[PDB]
């Protein structure tokens, strides 16, 4: 579909940075996930990608996951709230920020997943807070052992876009 | 004008020791927020919204997902590009920009974002907060910037 096609094209023009694992060219999805057009594409697409899962909230590890998470929340359809897992931050805070997740089915989002260590950190911290995790969903996958590592914690891993969808 | 009252009673039910992350990350209260910040700053010319990370992020994103013209968002990191960027999102350099906050006390947090944007080379249009514990307007004004808010003191009964 041209929703998926339009997102790819936006990410190419919006998100690719040339220059100096060593990389010599990286994504930086924040240019897409905080983009008015691309954010709306991400939210709809993730909701469809994860339609079979019964989660009542979305979120993940602060910064990258945040715009992805509120895109899903702000997308049309069933009410889903968002949370934010802090990068282990300690007057007024919280390690999981936003409406109550205790005893709730929850979806873990990420913007770009390479090692999968990042979304699993959110997974570990959610589980510890008494939230049940339905699975992990990311915008772009970066073709490492992300599924096999996520799978190892009992979780399905899905993504909208591979590197080949981006010409990368 | 009427949406404002609805949010006041959601902010109380969910947030109030305020915790606006319970309302800003809430499906209904965030929608009302995004729609109300656009209206409360409709006379200002900006192409992007954002502020200092965590607190401001769900607010800016509220504004970006509400109806109307295309506003992009950004995030000012509070700590030091490991592999990133100081201000995250579409380029903010040479743009007219709205600084937001969830809750401002002294005016300190949105000023950190203002200071970072000015150095980025962005034009700050004004500061809009969801909840205004009362010295902030005069601190923002001293930086030559208008400061506006949705809710304040009497609204929450706090």
CA distances from A155 to A84, A92, A108, A123, A124 (A): 19, 32, 10, 10, 12
- Which run of H or of E encompasses A121? helix A117-128
Neighbours of A128 (CB within 10 A): 10
User: How close B33 gets to chain A, by Cα (Å)?
Assistant: 12
| Three-class SS state of A132 | strand
| Three-class SS state of B137 | helix
In chain B the domains, ranked by start, together with CATH numbers, are 2-158 (3.40.50.2020)
> If you ran DSSP here, which 8-state letter would residue B14 be given?
I
- Which run of H or of E encompasses B48? strand B48-52
Quick one: which of B139, B48, B113 has its CA closest to A31?
Answer: B48
> If you ran DSSP here, which 8-state letter would residue A135 be given?
E
DSSP string, A53-119: ---SEEE-BTTTHHHHHHHHHHSSSS--EE-EE-SS------SEESS--TT-EEEEEEEEESSSHHH
Question: The tokens of A167 are what?
Answer: 């010409």
Show residues of chain B in contact with A92, CB under 8 Å. 17-19
Pairing mode, strands A25-26 and A57-59: unpaired
- Contact (CB, 8 A) for B23 and B8: no
Q: Is A26 on the interface with B (CB under 8 A)?
A: yes
**Can you say how many angstroms the Cα of residue A131 is from the centroid of all Cα atoms in its chain?**
17
User: CA B29, CA B27: separation in Å to the nearest integer?
Assistant: 6
**What are residue A113's DSSP bridge partners?**
A141
| Three-class SS state of A46 | helix
Nearby residues of B61 by Cβ (< 8 Å), 6 or more positions away = A34, A39, A66, A67, A70, A71, A74, B34, B73
CB contact under 8 A, B65 and A71: yes
Count Cβ neighbours within 10 Å for each residue of A62-93 and write b for 16 or more, e otherwise. Answer: bbbbbbbbbbbbbbeeeebbbbbbbeeeeeee
User: How close A155 gets to chain B, by Cα (Å)?
Assistant: 25
**What are residue B125's DSSP bridge partners?**
none
Instruction: Tell me how far apart the terminal alpha carbons of chain B are, to the nearest angstrom.
Output: 21
Residue B104 CB-density burial (10 A; 0-12 exposed, 13-18 middle, 19+ buried) = buried
Does B105 belong to an annotated binding site? yes
Show residues of chain A in contact with B58, CB under 8 Å. 66, 70, 82, 84, 98
3-state helix, strand, coil in chain A (%, to 5): 40, 25, 40
Nearby residues of B93 by Cβ (< 8 Å), 6 or more positions away = B120, B121, B122
| Three-class SS state of A127 | helix
Quick one: which of B39, B7, B6, B1 has its CA closest to B131?
Answer: B7
Pairing mode, strands A132-141 and A157-161: parallel
Q: How was this structure determined?
A: X-ray
CB contact under 8 A, A84 and B24: no
Nearby residues of A88 by Cβ (< 8 Å), 6 or more positions away = A95
- Contact (CB, 8 A) for B24 and B62: yes
Question: The tokens of A39 are what?
Answer: 């954010």
Show residues of chain B in contact with A63, CB under 8 Å. 53, 75, 77, 88
Phi first, then psi, for residue A111 (nearest 5°) are -85, -60
Quick one: which of A92, A97, A94 has its CA closest to A82?
Answer: A97
Q: Is A39 on the interface with B (CB under 8 A)?
A: yes
| Three-class SS state of B22 | helix
User: CA B46, CA A20: separation in Å to the nearest integer?
Assistant: 33
- Contact (CB, 8 A) for B3 and B146: no
């Amino acid at each position: 579909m041209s929703k998926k096609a339009e997102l790819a094209e936006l990410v190419k023009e919006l998100a690719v940075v040339h220059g100096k694992k060593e990389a010599d060219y990286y994504v930086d999805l924040r240019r897409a996930t905080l983009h008015a057009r691309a954010s709306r594409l991400i939210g709809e697409l993730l909701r469809e990608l994860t339609a079979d899962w019964d989660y009542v909230a979305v979120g993940g590890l602060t910064l990258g996951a945040d715009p992805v998470a509120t895109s899903v929340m702000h997308a049309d359809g069933r009410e889903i709230h968002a949370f934010v897992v802090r990068k282990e931050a300690k007057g007024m805070q919280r390690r999981i920020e936003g409406p109550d997740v205790v005893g709730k089915k929850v979806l873990v989002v990420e913007d770009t997943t390479t090692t999968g260590n990042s979304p699993l950190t959110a997974v570990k911290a959610l589980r510890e807070a008494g939230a049940e995790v339905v699975g992990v969903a990311t915008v772009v996958d970066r073709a490492t052992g992300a599924a096999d590592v996520i799978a190892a914690e009992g979780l399905e891993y899905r993504y909208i876009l591979g590197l080949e969808d981006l010409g990368l």
